[PDB]
């Protein structure tokens, strides 16, 4: 099972990014809060490496670490986007 970043929320302020994880085609959509050692943006594939680590874009060298995830809802997405930026 591999996923597609359909939306992404850049940060510095607590390193925690948030992105909409979706089906590899967009047919199903979710949200995840993650930490990242590299940039990640819309159109990137994600593929698992272990329970929490996933590749970025399509290559194993670049990684995120999942922290939480949920089914998509608009208020629940924007909530996590706020947490990515110290709740503003």
Deposited experimental method: NMR
d(CA 77, CA 70): 9
52: which residues sit within 8 A by CB, 6+ positions away? Answer: 65, 66, 67
Q: Are 71 and 55 in contact (CB under 8 A)?
A: no
CATH number at residue 16: 2.40.50.650
- Provide the domain count of the chain: 1
d(CA 24, CA 46): 9
C-alpha 88 chain-centroid distance: 19
Helix or strand (DSSP H, E) at 42? none
Domain that holds residue 72: 1-88
């Amino acid at each position: 099972m591999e996923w597609l970043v359909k939306k992404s929320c850049c940060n510095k302020q607590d390193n925690r990014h948030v992105l909409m994880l979706c089906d590899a085609g967009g047919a199903i959509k979710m949200i995840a809060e993650v930490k990242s050692d590299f940039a990640v943006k819309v159109g990137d594939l994600l593929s698992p490496l272990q329970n929490a680590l996933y590749c970025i874009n399509r290559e194993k060298l670049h990684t995120v670490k999942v922290l939480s995830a949920s089914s998509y809802s608009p208020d629940e997405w924007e909530r996590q986007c706020k947490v990515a930026g110290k709740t503003q």
